[PDB]
Amino acid sequence: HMISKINGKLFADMIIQGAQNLSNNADLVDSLNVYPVPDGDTGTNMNLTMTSGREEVENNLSKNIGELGKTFSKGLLMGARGNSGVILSQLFRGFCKNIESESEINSKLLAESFQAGVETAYKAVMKPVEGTILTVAKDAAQAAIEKANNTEDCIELMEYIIVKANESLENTPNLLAVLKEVGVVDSGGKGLLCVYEGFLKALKGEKV
Numbered sequence: 001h002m003i004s005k006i007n008g009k010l011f012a013d014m015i016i017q018g019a020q021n022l023s024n025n026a027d028l029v030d031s032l033n034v035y036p037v038p039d040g041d042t043g044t045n046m047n048l049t050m051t052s053g054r055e056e057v058e059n060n061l062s063k064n065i066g067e068l069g070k071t072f073s074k075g076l077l078m079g080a081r082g083n084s085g086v087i088l089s090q091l092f093r094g095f096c097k098n099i100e101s102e103s104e105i106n107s108k109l110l111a112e113s114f115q116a117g118v119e120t121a122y123k124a125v126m127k128p129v130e131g132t133i134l135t136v137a138k139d140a141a142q143a144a145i146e147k148a149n150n151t152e153d154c155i156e157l158m159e160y161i162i163v164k165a166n167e168s169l170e171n172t173p174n175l176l177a178v179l180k181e182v183g184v185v186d187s188g189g190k191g192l193l194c195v196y197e198g199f200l201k202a203l204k205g206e207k208v
């Protein structure tokens with residue numbers, strides 16, 4: 001029960017399950033939102049952003065992952081809501097750009113694509129702040145790169161990404177005072193974990 005190659009339909013499934021899992025957790029993610037203003041909308045913003053990506057994907061499936069990523073990417077970018085939706089759309093724009101000429105990817109390209117998304121999002125945000133979705137995504141990609149170096153299995157890779165992304169998210173209150181004073185982890189980072197956990201379900205052949 002090992003996934004060594006991700007084609008366009010497996011990536012579509014990861015997108016759909018990631019979106020569904022975020023949707024199911026959107027009210028919780030909204031309730032955590034305090035930075036930079038406590039306006040209760042991170043989960044809705046990222047839910048609607050990922051739904052735009054998911055809708056484009058569902059209507060334009062492909063075996064070729066690079067083509068499927070262009071479709072996903074365009075959907076996010078034309079529906080990005082709020083700080084968190086804009087960052088989410090830029091993380092996956094860089095991820096999808098990195099694979100655009102590929103028909104399927106392996107664990108090392110997957111890890112490199114998370115890293116590529118981190119670089120794109122950090123450059124897109126004019127004044128990046130730590131303790132946020134950027135930090136969680138950055139720590140997830142660094143873990144990806146380290147683990148893919150000795151693992152062909154994308155399921156075991158994604159498991160490890162989630163463990164390290166989760167530790168990063170639990171640390172966000174130590175980087176950003178408002179998170180610590182209110183007593184919450186970063187809502188953007190939590191929304192991103194929801195998507196990553198859907199990715200893992202799909203890699204396992206399961207539904208959310």
Ligand SMILES: Nc1ncnc2c1ncn2[C@@H]1O[C@H](COP(=O)(O)OP(=O)(O)O)[C@@H](O)[C@H]1O
Pocket residue numbers: 033034035036037039041042043045046081082083084085087125127128129130131132133134186187188189
């Ligand atoms: N400068 C920044 N750098 C990194 N992340 C940010 C920044 N500003 C906002 N975020 C992310 O966005 C999340 C809030 O998203 P959202 O509620 O959609 O923003 P808003 O409602 O202010 O548009 C934060 O929890 C954090 O993860």
Ligand SMILES: [Co+2]
Pocket residue numbers: 054055058
């Ligand atoms: Co639909």
Ligand SMILES: [Co+2]
Pocket residue numbers: 101102
């Ligand atoms: Co090639």
Ligand SMILES: [Co+2]
Pocket residue numbers: 104
């Ligand atoms: Co092949």
Ligand SMILES: [Co+2]
Pocket residue numbers: none
């Ligand atoms: Co690089």
Ligand SMILES: [Co+2]
Pocket residue numbers: 122123125126127
């Ligand atoms: Co800059």
Ligand SMILES: [Mg+2]
Pocket residue numbers: 033035036037038039040041042082
């Ligand atoms: Mg908000």
Ligand SMILES: [Mg+2]
Pocket residue numbers: 039041082
């Ligand atoms: Mg808002």
